[PDB]
């Protein structure tokens, strides 16, 4: 009872968190008080509710924990010029233009933590005309986002970039999982009215497989170089090429081009690319083929263990 | 107060008012450590003072040592009424009033000796006579004969 | 680590990782002394530093004390499961599982008391009947009657 | 037994007591002693019938 907790009290999470304390607090006689925190470095591992390790505390401070009631957010860092030379073409944040198609992608992609967006419009009076989804309700559009943050931010962004009467549309049973059942209730409006409709989905996490045969090169090159190159391309760290996004088909020629771009002086003889479902058993040796095609709502990543190279 | 022990096995003495001993002085402030018994800062800048120390009990020369255990380790009272005398090759346990073993399973590995009467399972052993078949259920005459 | 004892009789606690206590600092360098445990020259000129010290185990307030022996010496565990309570005039020995005496010759000097069955030399005492002459070698009816 | 009560010994009631002691006292062999109280603030507050 009757203890004051001063600001910048270094609180440490068990995976080397080193959180702080924002506002000084006095413990009430009830013994249950909530203190606001802030992390030290831009790179912060998502913590777990335990007894936070004590670094700096008063004579009376007993313990601190993380109850479920606490509400959390996420950081932002690692914005290299490569992301800029990729997002130049796509993230044309035409804030000046709202009722459009290229506007919605760019205005949604301004939301934090969002990785990629697709928006495909029908423009006709019949169903099943766009590249990869059904319609049901004609004269509408459907939106798919990846790496999605909490609902309200993307809901406001989506409602702020459309203008048509009823352009919202869930695709069909053959599409990404809807985020919410009936709607997303965008409560507030500039008109103060109680309008409520937002509909959007998320992609299907696929998985890809790559196997390539090469020559030995000018000198010895470990396979880790090739694995790192293909993984780095898949994540999208290279300039120009966005890598793999929501709605990008893996191509053996493109993967070979990325390998040549990273490590030159090697003679690639064979290239194979295959795609596998989520959690499915590893594809059989006969599954690989030259070219794979992915639909609009299919996202695929590549790990280090999915690329295996055996030179001649 | 210091209570020696580690690995979950300690020793304590029933201190009361008026007992003597020694007190040491810690290097820094230990209150923040004494609250949580973990790594902590010094509370203040006070150093090498008796305010935050450590007490060690002692009795000095106030005891009686019995003539038999003049060369054997003793754990006793001040007056030697109760003793646990651990000699070089034998042990002696002294208690003028009585002793108890609260263990629900005892064991021995050798010859045993008693010097007076026995009581087992609520009855006696120094006078026990078992009934027989002839005469019918008559008491075995006498008690405990070699 | 300090292990109290002299005249060939010492006490040791099974210390493991994570046990706490106090550490003292020696006046001079004692590495050469710990190398042979005899009279020795100091090694270096370092003085009053924790590099060459002495550790004393302790448990502080982390134990449970049973309400019965609130005035007697206790040698126990943290939880008090096993105890040796040396009171002013009696001794109580507690062991929830079992106890043993590895001595090949025990002794007693007074009345003894048991509260359950007895086993001696592999056979029972609480139900035993001795064969007689007539009837020929017949079992003594019953067991242990007072 | 034989406790040396000190000044400013703060006693806090559940409805924001924060009450000092006014003058020092020493505990007697009885085990009960009388001490005085002054409020850490300058408003009208009331003490509860029981110790808190």
Residue numbers in the entry:
A (entry chain s): 106 to 417
B (entry chain F), C (entry chain n): 76 to 221
D (entry chain v): 106 to 157
Reproduce text from the manuscript describing this model:
Bacteriophage E217 infects Pseudomonas aeruginosa and is part of an experimental phage cocktail developed to eradicate P. aeruginosa infections in Galleria mellonella (wax moth) larvae and vertebrate models. E217 is a PB1-like Myoviridae of the Pbunavirus genus characterized by a ~66.2 kbp genome, significantly smaller than the classical enterobacteria phage T4 (~169 kbp). Here, we describe the structure of the whole E217 virion before and after DNA ejection at 3.1 Å and 4.5 Å resolution, respectively, determined using cryogenic electron microscopy (cryo-EM). We identify and build de novo structures for 19 unique E217 gene products, resolve the tail genome-ejection machine in both extended and contracted states, and decipher the complete architecture of the baseplate formed by 66 polypeptide chains.
We determined a localized reconstruction of the extended baseplate at 3.4 Å resolution (FSC = 0.143) and a lower resolution reconstruction after contraction. We built a complete atomic model of all factors in the extended baseplate, which consists of 11 unique proteins repeated in 66 copies. The total mass of the baseplate is 1.4 MDa excluding six trimeric tail fibers emanating at the wedges of the baseplate. We deciphered the complete architecture of the E217 baseplate that we rationalized as two complexes, an idle cap complex that seals the distal end of the tail tube and a mobile complex, the nut, which attaches to the cap via adaptor factors, gp33, and gp34. First, the baseplate cap formed by gp36, gp37/gp38, gp41, and gp43 assembles onto the repetitive tail tube, sealing the genome-ejection channel. The symmetry fallout from the sixfold tail tube to the trimeric tail tip is transmitted through the heterodimeric gp37/gp38 complex, which also recruits the adaptors gp33 and gp34. The third subcomplex in the E217 baseplate, or nut, is built by six copies of the triplex complex that assemble at the bottom of the baseplate surrounding the cap complex. Notably, gp44-a and gp44-b are the same protein but in drastically distinct conformations, with the conformer gp44-a being globular and gp44-b extended, like beads-on-a-string. In the extended tail, gp44-a and gp44-b make a handshaking contact at the baseplate rim.
